[PDB]
Design an enzyme around this catalytic site. Sequence first.
Site, PDB file in Angstrom:
ATOM      1  N   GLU A 104       8.964   3.323 -12.334  1.00  0.00           N
ATOM      2  CA  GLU A 104       7.514   3.503 -12.336  1.00  0.00           C
ATOM      3  C   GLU A 104       7.070   4.285 -13.563  1.00  0.00           C
ATOM      4  O   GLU A 104       6.160   3.865 -14.286  1.00  0.00           O
ATOM      5  CB  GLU A 104       7.062   4.238 -11.070  1.00  0.00           C
ATOM      6  CG  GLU A 104       7.046   3.424  -9.794  1.00  0.00           C
ATOM      7  CD  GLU A 104       6.977   4.336  -8.575  1.00  0.00           C
ATOM      8  OE1 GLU A 104       8.030   4.912  -8.214  1.00  0.00           O
ATOM      9  OE2 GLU A 104       5.870   4.503  -7.996  1.00  0.00           O
ATOM     10  N   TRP A 168      13.740   5.951  -5.448  1.00  0.00           N
ATOM     11  CA  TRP A 168      13.071   5.718  -4.174  1.00  0.00           C
ATOM     12  C   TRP A 168      11.869   4.799  -4.399  1.00  0.00           C
ATOM     13  O   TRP A 168      10.797   5.265  -4.810  1.00  0.00           O
ATOM     14  CB  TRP A 168      12.644   7.057  -3.558  1.00  0.00           C
ATOM     15  CG  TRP A 168      11.968   6.993  -2.209  1.00  0.00           C
ATOM     16  CD1 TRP A 168      11.468   5.889  -1.570  1.00  0.00           C
ATOM     17  CD2 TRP A 168      11.719   8.101  -1.346  1.00  0.00           C
ATOM     18  NE1 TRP A 168      10.927   6.246  -0.361  1.00  0.00           N
ATOM     19  CE2 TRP A 168      11.070   7.599  -0.198  1.00  0.00           C
ATOM     20  CE3 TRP A 168      12.000   9.473  -1.425  1.00  0.00           C
ATOM     21  CZ2 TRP A 168      10.671   8.424   0.857  1.00  0.00           C
ATOM     22  CZ3 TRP A 168      11.607  10.289  -0.382  1.00  0.00           C
ATOM     23  CH2 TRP A 168      10.952   9.761   0.747  1.00  0.00           C
ATOM     24  N   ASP A 170       8.492   2.713  -4.415  1.00  0.00           N
ATOM     25  CA  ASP A 170       7.163   2.796  -3.835  1.00  0.00           C
ATOM     26  C   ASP A 170       7.075   2.024  -2.526  1.00  0.00           C
ATOM     27  O   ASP A 170       7.618   0.924  -2.392  1.00  0.00           O
ATOM     28  CB  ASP A 170       6.144   2.223  -4.811  1.00  0.00           C
ATOM     29  CG  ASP A 170       4.774   2.815  -4.626  1.00  0.00           C
ATOM     30  OD1 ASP A 170       3.917   2.608  -5.522  1.00  0.00           O
ATOM     31  OD2 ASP A 170       4.594   3.544  -3.611  1.00  0.00           O
ATOM     32  N   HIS A 216       5.518  15.550  -5.456  1.00  0.00           N
ATOM     33  CA  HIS A 216       4.641  14.415  -5.672  1.00  0.00           C
ATOM     34  C   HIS A 216       5.474  13.158  -5.867  1.00  0.00           C
ATOM     35  O   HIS A 216       6.674  13.212  -6.159  1.00  0.00           O
ATOM     36  CB  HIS A 216       3.655  14.670  -6.836  1.00  0.00           C
ATOM     37  CG  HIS A 216       4.264  14.703  -8.206  1.00  0.00           C
ATOM     38  ND1 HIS A 216       4.718  13.573  -8.854  1.00  0.00           N
ATOM     39  CD2 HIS A 216       4.416  15.723  -9.085  1.00  0.00           C
ATOM     40  CE1 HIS A 216       5.164  13.902 -10.056  1.00  0.00           C
ATOM     41  NE2 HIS A 216       4.995  15.204 -10.220  1.00  0.00           N
ATOM     42  N   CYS A 217       4.816  12.021  -5.622  1.00  0.00           N
ATOM     43  CA  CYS A 217       5.388  10.703  -5.900  1.00  0.00           C
ATOM     44  C   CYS A 217       4.413  10.026  -6.844  1.00  0.00           C
ATOM     45  O   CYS A 217       4.148  10.559  -7.926  1.00  0.00           O
ATOM     46  CB  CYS A 217       5.686   9.954  -4.604  1.00  0.00           C
ATOM     47  SG  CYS A 217       4.305  10.004  -3.382  1.00  0.00           S
ATOM     48  N   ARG A 223       5.840   8.658  -0.083  1.00  0.00           N
ATOM     49  CA  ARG A 223       7.146   9.294  -0.116  1.00  0.00           C
ATOM     50  C   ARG A 223       7.018  10.815  -0.004  1.00  0.00           C
ATOM     51  O   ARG A 223       7.824  11.468   0.670  1.00  0.00           O
ATOM     52  CB  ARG A 223       7.870   8.851  -1.391  1.00  0.00           C
ATOM     53  CG  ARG A 223       7.968   7.341  -1.508  1.00  0.00           C
ATOM     54  CD  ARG A 223       8.196   6.872  -2.955  1.00  0.00           C
ATOM     55  NE  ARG A 223       6.945   6.709  -3.680  1.00  0.00           N
ATOM     56  CZ  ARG A 223       6.843   6.221  -4.915  1.00  0.00           C
ATOM     57  NH1 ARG A 223       7.930   5.838  -5.590  1.00  0.00           N
ATOM     58  NH2 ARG A 223       5.649   6.104  -5.480  1.00  0.00           N
ATOM     59  N   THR A 224       5.982  11.386  -0.628  1.00  0.00           N
ATOM     60  CA  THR A 224       5.738  12.822  -0.552  1.00  0.00           C
ATOM     61  C   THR A 224       5.582  13.284   0.892  1.00  0.00           C
ATOM     62  O   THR A 224       6.150  14.306   1.289  1.00  0.00           O
ATOM     63  CB  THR A 224       4.483  13.167  -1.354  1.00  0.00           C
ATOM     64  OG1 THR A 224       4.739  13.009  -2.753  1.00  0.00           O
ATOM     65  CG2 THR A 224       4.047  14.585  -1.088  1.00  0.00           C
TER      66      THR A 224
END
EC number: 3.1.3.48
Length: 282
Positions: A104, A168, A170, A216-217, A223-224
Site C-alpha cells: 500500500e 496485513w 487491507d 494506524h493502518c 486493522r487498527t
Amino acid sequence: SPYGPEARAELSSRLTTLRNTLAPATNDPRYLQACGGEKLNRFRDIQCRRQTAVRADLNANYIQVGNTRTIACQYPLQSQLESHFRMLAENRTPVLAVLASSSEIANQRFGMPDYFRQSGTYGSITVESKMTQQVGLGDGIMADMYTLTIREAGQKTISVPVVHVTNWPDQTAVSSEVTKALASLVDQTAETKRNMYESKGSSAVADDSKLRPVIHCRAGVGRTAQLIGAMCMNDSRNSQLSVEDMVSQMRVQRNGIMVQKDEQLDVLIKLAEGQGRPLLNS
C-alpha cells in the site's frame, strides 16, 4: 450458546445500529472539521470524533477501552506529517504500530508517505529512521521494527519504537493467533520504552494523555481496531468487559467504522470466547 449464532446475530444487530447512527452528517458537530481548505480526512466518510481528537489538524483519537489507553489514527497525509511527528513526540510515544502494508505504502496512487522507513525533514522537524530487528508473527505475517528519532530545534529529542506489520492486507482479518502475537509484541515494545522513561524519572509516566501506543493502518478503522481490541483483551484490568462494550467504545470515541469487516469482529469474538469474555451486555 453464549457465542452461538443467535448471540452473534444480536451483537451484529446492536453494533450495526450504532454504525448507522454514527454516520457523519455534513458539518457534523460530533466530528472534527477541516480548516480553510486543507484535506483532513483521508477518506471523506471516515471522520475523527471531536471530543477525543488529539490535534486540530489530524484525523486521530484518544481511545480508552475499559482501562486500555491508545491513540488510533489514519495514515497521516503528506501535509499532516509535521503535525503527526509533533503528536508522536508530545505523546512520548512508547510504540507506533503501523499496520499498512509495504505494498500500500509503495503504491503512490494511495498518497501514503513513507515516513517511518526513511529519514526525512518536515518543516522544523527532522526525522532519522533506523531499522532494528525483524520478527515473524505466524501465518507468514512479518513485522519490521524501526526506531524514529524526532528532532526539532529547541525541543527535546524523542525516539519512538516502530512496529510495522508488512503484509496485513487491507480489509482482511489476520488470524486470532497472529493477532494475539502482534498485541503481545506491541505491548512488550511499549512496556520496554515506558520503563526507560520511568527509569529516568519522566513525569510523563503519571499523565494519562501520554505514553499511549499509537496505531494506524490506512484509515485507522479496520486493522487498527482489531489490534486495539486484542490489546484491550490483553489487559488483565479489563476483566468482564464485553465485546459489545469494547467495539461501542471504539466507535463512540473514533467513528462508526471501527471494526470495519465482519471477519475482524469474528477474530475479536474468537479471542473473547477463548477468554470466557462476554459478547453482549446484561
